[PDB]
Amino acid sequence: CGQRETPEGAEAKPWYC
């Protein structure tokens, strides 16, 4: 995903938003 739950501090996309 790329809508909400992709914070910079994660340095990665987790899974879903």
From Swiss-Prot:
Residues included from the entire protein: 178 to 191 of 233
Superkingdom assignment: Eukaryota
Record's subcellular location: Secreted
Organism field: Homo sapiens
Protein known as: Tumor necrosis factor, soluble form
Gene behind this protein: TNF
